[PDB]
């Protein structure tokens, strides 16, 4: 029941959430994406076990708006900030790109939260999966 951070975690495989919804994605691979994301929403992924230090994160994302950013925290949605990535407009809700942002994560078993931040005036983005790099 540990999750491997160095292979893809599907955004839809969350253990808790606030304010989000899932739909079938068009992206390469099939499955679902999360969506209907607004400033302040989040998703929690339990038991993410890092065996080596991570220095970046890759997120598969889409946006039909000015976009927003993804905060990586642990423990809780107001837990320590380990990194972020900004998701830009990408042309569409189903126009997928892979962004990358720096993180600093020591070895450890964490509850990983992706907290979504941006303007309250529009939905921010869709997310499909993510994976870390050492």
Ligand X SMILES: OC[C@H]1O[C@@H](O[C@@H]2[C@@H](O)[C@H](O[C@@H]3[C@@H](O)[C@H](O[C@@H]4[C@@H](O)[C@@H](O[C@@H]5[C@@H](O)[C@H](O[C@@H]6[C@@H](O)[C@H](O)O[C@H](CO)[C@H]6O)O[C@H](CO)[C@H]5O)O[C@H](CO)[C@H]4O)O[C@H](CO)[C@H]3O)O[C@H](CO)[C@H]2O)[C@H](O)[C@@H](O)[C@@H]1O
Binding residues for (1,3-beta-D-glucosyl)n: 23, 36, 64, 89, 123, 126
Q: Could you say whether residue 128 binds ligand X (CB under 6 A)?
A: no
CA distance 13 to 2: 13
* Residue 131, number of CB atoms within 10 A of its CB: 17
Q: Could you say whether residue 45 binds ligand X (CB under 6 A)?
A: no
CA distance 102 to 38: 22
Which of 128, 120, 121, 96 has the alpha carbon at shortest distance from 31?
A: 128
Which of 77, 6, 1, 90 has the alpha carbon at shortest distance from 39?
A: 77
Residue 127 C-beta: closest distance to Na ion, Å = 8
Q: Could you say whether residue 58 binds ligand X (CB under 6 A)?
A: no
Site string for ligand X, 105-124 (x = CB under 6 A): -----------------xx-
- Among Na ion, ligand X, none, the one that 19 touches (CB under a kind-dependent 5 to 8 A) is Na ion
Q: Of 32, 58, 64, 111, which lies in the binding site for ligand X, with binding defined by CB under 6 A?
A: 64
Whether the Cβ atoms of residue 25 and residue 94 lie closer than 8 Å to each other: yes
Q: Which residues bind ligand X (CB under 6 A)?
A: 23, 35-36, 64-66, 89, 91, 93, 122-123, 126
């Amino acid at each position: 029941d540990l999750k491997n951070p160095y292979e893809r975690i599907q955004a839809e495989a969350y253990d808790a959430m606030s304010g989000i919804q899932t739909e079938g994605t068009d992206d390469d691979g099939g499955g679902d994406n999360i969506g209907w994301i607004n400033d302040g929403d989040w998703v929690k992924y339990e038991r993410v076990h890092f065996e080596r230090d991570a220095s970046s994160i890759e997120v598969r994302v889409a946006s039909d708006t000015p976009g927003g950013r993804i905060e990586i925290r642990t423990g809780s949605p107001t837990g320590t900030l380990l990194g972020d990535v900004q998701v830009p407009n990408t042309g569409g809700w189903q126009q997928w790109q892979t962004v990358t942002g720096n993180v600093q994560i020591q070895p450890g078993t964490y509850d990983v939260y992706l907290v979504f931040k941006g303007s309250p005036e529009y939905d921010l983005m869709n997310v499909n999966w993510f994976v870390f790099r050492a």
